[PDB]
Write a protein that binds this ligand. Structure first.
Ligand code: NA
Length: 310
């Protein structure tokens, strides 16, 4: 009785002294912001607690080569644009496929792109963009590619981490004020991510778990994402979803998964049913049905959000 108040007091002082998400019980509900950047998977949006990526914060998305981390980033870009936002993409990798981006939903024509000469030029340009107040989202591809000028110009070793540290402490204020989200893509956490690990409000570990198949042909990959860090909602939640080659994150696939998870979609055998109606036999028909019938896919989306507050 007398200790329940001391803990509430303790938590409050921590909250006041260090910020809103400085301590949380893992069973807590998330405090919902006004706006967020949805990820493309409702499952991931739920895993993040606040229904998507936070605004005015640093995000890290890391994983192996071709884990899907860039696909997740590009979906964040599409949704930011889809709600009238402007996007930028700081590219030190030169791997971007705009056609793939296009099929996800990215307005590539409007997408600001920069291919900077050095790591510090990359971060300075990003910061220049962020302070404009005009961007909703900027993506940095990638952390490891942010090679310092000195190293590129042929000149001890350790200053890439120092470059990130310096840049992030300056960038973090610019992001809060602007309400711009910065997503750092990072490989396997790798060459400056040790500062990013503490500056990031969200960190997402992205991985392939199995190849999806249409008979013997590889159509895509089931993808798993763990929110290892989350300052806006309890951390350590994970989600799975499908990335289909040439299309990206199957929005409809996630609606079904979370649909059955939430009891909104029942399962009379291999038949997925919704509201007395039938959606399809097997996952693909249920999936294909939802894209062909966008109105019911939004019905299922609104219902899932209502049950969880997302
Ligand atoms: Na790409």
């Amino acid at each position: 009785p007398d200790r329940e108040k001391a803990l509430e007091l303790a938590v409050a002082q921590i909250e006041k002294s260090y910020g809103k998400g400085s301590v949380m019980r893992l069973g807590d509900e998330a405090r919902q912001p006004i706006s967020v950047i949805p990820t493309g998977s409702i499952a991931l949006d739920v895993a993040l607690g606040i229904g998507g990526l936070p605004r005015g914060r640093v995000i890290e998305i890391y994983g192996p080569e071709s884990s899907g981390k860039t696909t997740v980033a590009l979906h964040a870009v599409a949704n930011a644009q889809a709600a009238g936002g402007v996007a930028a993409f700081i590219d030190a990798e030169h791997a971007l496929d705009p056609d793939y981006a296009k099929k996800l939903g990215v307005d590539t024509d409007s997408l600001l792109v920069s291919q900077p000469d050095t790591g510090e030029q990359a971060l300075e340009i990003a910061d220049m963009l962020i302070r404009s107040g005009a961007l909703d989202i900027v993506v940095i591809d990638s952390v490891a590619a942010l090679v310092p000028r000195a190293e590129l110009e042929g000149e001890h070793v350790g200053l890439q981490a120092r470059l990130m540290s310096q840049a992030l402490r300056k960038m973090t204020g610019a992001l809060n004020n602007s309400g711009t989200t910065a997503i750092f893509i990072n490989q396997l956490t790798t060459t400056g991510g040790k500062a990013l690990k503490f500056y990031a409000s969200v960190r997402m570990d992205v991985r392939r778990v199995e190849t999806l198949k249409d008979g013997t042909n590889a159509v895509g990959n089931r993808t798993r994402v763990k929110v290892v860090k989350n300052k806006c909602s309890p951390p350590f939640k994970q989600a799975e979803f499908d990335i289909l080659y040439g299309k990206g994150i199957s929005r409809e696939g996630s609606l079904i998964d979370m649909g059955v998870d939430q009891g909104l979609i029942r399962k009379s055998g291999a038949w997925f049913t919704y509201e007395g109606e039938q959606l399809g036999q097997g996952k693909e028909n249920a999936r294909n049905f939802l894209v062909e019938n966008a109105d019911v896919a939004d019905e299922i989306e609104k219902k899932i959000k209502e049950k969880l507050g997302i």
